Design a protein around this motif. Sequence first.
Motif, mmCIF file in Angstrom:
data_model
loop_
_atom_site.group_PDB
_atom_site.id
_atom_site.type_symbol
_atom_site.label_atom_id
_atom_site.label_comp_id
_atom_site.label_asym_id
_atom_site.label_seq_id
_atom_site.Cartn_x
_atom_site.Cartn_y
_atom_site.Cartn_z
ATOM 1 N N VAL A 131 38.570 16.411 37.769
ATOM 2 C CA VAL A 131 39.634 17.132 37.862
ATOM 3 C C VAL A 131 39.975 17.794 39.109
ATOM 4 C CG1 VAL A 131 40.056 17.109 35.362
ATOM 5 C CG2 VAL A 131 38.681 18.883 36.672
ATOM 6 N N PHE A 132 38.899 18.013 40.119
ATOM 7 C CA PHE A 132 39.101 18.760 41.170
ATOM 8 C C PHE A 132 38.049 18.464 42.155
ATOM 9 C CE2 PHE A 132 38.685 22.186 44.093
ATOM 10 C CZ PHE A 132 40.052 22.709 44.445
ATOM 11 N N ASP A 133 38.333 18.039 43.364
ATOM 12 C CA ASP A 133 37.389 17.966 44.236
ATOM 13 C C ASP A 133 37.662 18.781 45.667
ATOM 14 O OD1 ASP A 133 35.395 16.642 46.102
ATOM 15 O OD2 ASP A 133 36.482 15.290 46.716
ATOM 16 N N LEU A 134 36.486 19.753 45.775
ATOM 17 C CA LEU A 134 36.543 20.785 46.815
ATOM 18 C C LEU A 134 36.666 20.302 48.107
ATOM 19 C CD1 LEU A 134 36.297 24.038 46.609
ATOM 20 C CD2 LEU A 134 33.830 23.589 47.148
ATOM 21 N N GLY A 135 36.236 19.071 48.426
ATOM 22 C CA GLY A 135 36.247 18.484 49.555
ATOM 23 C C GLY A 135 37.819 18.744 50.335
ATOM 24 N N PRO A 136 38.949 17.872 49.517
ATOM 25 C CA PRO A 136 40.235 18.042 49.961
ATOM 26 C C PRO A 136 40.741 19.157 50.176
ATOM 27 C CG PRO A 136 39.878 16.003 48.694
ATOM 28 C CD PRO A 136 38.479 16.945 48.863
ATOM 29 N N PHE A 137 40.029 20.170 49.222
ATOM 30 C CA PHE A 137 40.595 21.438 49.102
ATOM 31 C C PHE A 137 40.451 22.393 50.228
ATOM 32 C CE2 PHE A 137 42.267 25.328 47.156
ATOM 33 C CZ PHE A 137 41.377 26.312 47.502
ATOM 34 N N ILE A 138 39.043 22.180 50.832
ATOM 35 C CA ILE A 138 38.710 23.091 52.015
ATOM 36 C C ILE A 138 39.445 22.329 53.152
ATOM 37 C CG2 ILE A 138 37.033 23.773 53.447
ATOM 38 C CD1 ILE A 138 36.770 25.071 50.748
ATOM 39 N N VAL A 139 39.641 21.202 53.312
ATOM 40 C CA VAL A 139 40.261 20.614 54.403
ATOM 41 C C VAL A 139 41.826 21.022 54.531
ATOM 42 C CG1 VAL A 139 41.156 18.198 55.141
ATOM 43 C CG2 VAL A 139 38.817 18.492 54.428
ATOM 44 N N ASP A 140 42.499 21.118 53.269
ATOM 45 C CA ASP A 140 43.852 21.500 53.127
ATOM 46 C C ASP A 140 43.908 22.967 53.617
ATOM 47 O OD1 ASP A 140 44.176 18.973 52.346
ATOM 48 O OD2 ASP A 140 45.522 19.430 50.818
ATOM 49 N N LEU A 141 42.813 23.751 53.097
ATOM 50 C CA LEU A 141 42.692 25.338 53.275
ATOM 51 C C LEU A 141 42.720 25.259 54.805
ATOM 52 C CD1 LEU A 141 42.515 27.859 52.169
ATOM 53 C CD2 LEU A 141 40.261 27.788 51.997
ATOM 54 N N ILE A 142 42.008 24.834 55.698
ATOM 55 C CA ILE A 142 41.674 25.101 56.906
ATOM 56 C C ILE A 142 42.987 24.670 57.537
ATOM 57 C CG2 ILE A 142 40.701 24.248 59.054
ATOM 58 C CD1 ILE A 142 38.237 23.468 57.477
ATOM 59 N N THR A 143 43.804 23.590 57.257
ATOM 60 C CA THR A 143 44.961 23.301 57.914
ATOM 61 C C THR A 143 45.925 24.531 57.592
ATOM 62 O OG1 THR A 143 44.495 21.029 57.129
ATOM 63 C CG2 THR A 143 46.528 21.434 58.175
ATOM 64 N N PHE A 144 45.843 25.107 56.343
ATOM 65 C CA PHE A 144 46.805 26.374 56.004
ATOM 66 C C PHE A 144 46.359 27.330 56.738
ATOM 67 C CE2 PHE A 144 47.046 29.917 52.950
ATOM 68 C CZ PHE A 144 48.374 29.980 53.188
ATOM 69 N N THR A 145 45.130 27.784 57.214
ATOM 70 C CA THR A 145 44.646 28.912 58.230
ATOM 71 C C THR A 145 45.016 28.454 59.595
ATOM 72 O OG1 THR A 145 42.605 27.763 58.778
ATOM 73 C CG2 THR A 145 42.640 29.175 56.631
ATOM 74 N N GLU A 146 45.407 27.048 59.779
ATOM 75 C CA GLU A 146 45.734 26.617 61.098
ATOM 76 C C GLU A 146 47.382 26.526 61.126
ATOM 77 O OE1 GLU A 146 44.097 22.916 61.903
ATOM 78 O OE2 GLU A 146 41.931 23.750 62.162
ATOM 79 N N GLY A 147 47.878 27.329 60.430
ATOM 80 C CA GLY A 147 49.404 27.730 60.300
ATOM 81 C C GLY A 147 50.239 26.328 60.275
ATOM 82 N N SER A 148 49.829 25.606 59.264
ATOM 83 C CA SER A 148 50.351 24.167 59.559
ATOM 84 C C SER A 148 50.809 23.606 58.046
ATOM 85 C CB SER A 148 49.503 22.894 60.182
ATOM 86 O OG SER A 148 50.416 21.765 60.303
ATOM 87 N N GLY A 149 49.734 23.459 57.279
ATOM 88 C CA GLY A 149 50.092 22.653 56.035
ATOM 89 C C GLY A 149 50.273 23.682 54.819
ATOM 90 N N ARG A 150 50.793 23.566 53.631
ATOM 91 C CA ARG A 150 51.175 24.504 52.691
ATOM 92 C C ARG A 150 49.667 25.059 51.955
ATOM 93 N NH1 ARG A 150 53.605 20.768 47.881
ATOM 94 N NH2 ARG A 150 51.644 20.075 46.798
ATOM 95 N N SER A 151 49.868 25.979 51.078
ATOM 96 C CA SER A 151 48.847 26.474 50.387
ATOM 97 C C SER A 151 48.319 25.495 49.469
ATOM 98 C CB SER A 151 49.114 27.838 49.578
ATOM 99 O OG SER A 151 48.049 28.178 48.776
ATOM 100 N N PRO A 152 47.078 25.107 49.619
ATOM 101 C CA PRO A 152 46.537 24.092 48.495
ATOM 102 C C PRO A 152 46.286 24.431 47.166
ATOM 103 C CG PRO A 152 44.750 25.184 49.800
ATOM 104 C CD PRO A 152 45.831 25.615 50.260
ATOM 105 N N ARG A 153 46.806 23.861 46.317
ATOM 106 C CA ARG A 153 46.721 24.079 44.647
ATOM 107 C C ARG A 153 44.996 24.049 44.171
ATOM 108 N NH1 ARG A 153 51.366 25.858 46.640
ATOM 109 N NH2 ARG A 153 52.745 24.197 46.736
#
Lengths: 234, 10
Positions: A131-153
């Motif tokens: 139901v949840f993979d931490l991999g894509p979450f951290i990747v999206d989280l870094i992109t979120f810190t990198e003022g680009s993507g949205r907040s990962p769910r």
Amino acid sequence: ENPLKRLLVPGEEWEFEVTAFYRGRQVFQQTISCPEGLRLVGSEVGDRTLPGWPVTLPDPGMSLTDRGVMSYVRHVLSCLGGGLALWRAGQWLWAQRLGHCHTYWAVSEELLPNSGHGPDGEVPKDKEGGVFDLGPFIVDLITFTEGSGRSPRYALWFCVGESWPQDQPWTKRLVMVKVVPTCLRALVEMARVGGASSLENTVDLHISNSHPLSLTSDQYKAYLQDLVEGMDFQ
Amino acid sequence: EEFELLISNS
């Protein structure tokens, strides 16, 4: 040493905040820290020997006001049986149905289960399901810190006993359960306020055996990238 | 307000 790696060590326990909603009304909340995960049951009766920490959803009400639907809610709770198992294995969260209530899940926001994308699928019965993979979450989280993507769910919503409420108000469903790995709520929060410069902020990872973390924005982003490089990807 | 309970028995 990377303190964020503490999440993925075997023997460590994440905290799971379980919040239950009967017809758009919060009726239950409890936090669980168990190595064999949690288990959403409705107390009938049951198999005490089943693995996972038993989280009993409360009985509704027997009120003259709201009883035409509370009988339906009680009917769902009477068919959970073994219940909804939810545990962690490495970087994956796994969910499985042990009862007779078909359940649909999705990784969504905290104040809203149904965004529009529909459910991410149905909780399997014969096999365990990711139901949840931490991999894509951290990747999206870094992109979120990198003022680009949205907040990962990170919030796991479950629709129990009914089909997923797509294009319908989620307050109509009998039993909705939100489960939040409180470590992920913190990681997002740490990236929400921490991104001011190169100053220090404090993040409690909310896991078994862990201290608060005073990190700079650059240090946080560095640890996240190092976390990614030490995880499996598909 | 009608309810279709996906409760699978037997």
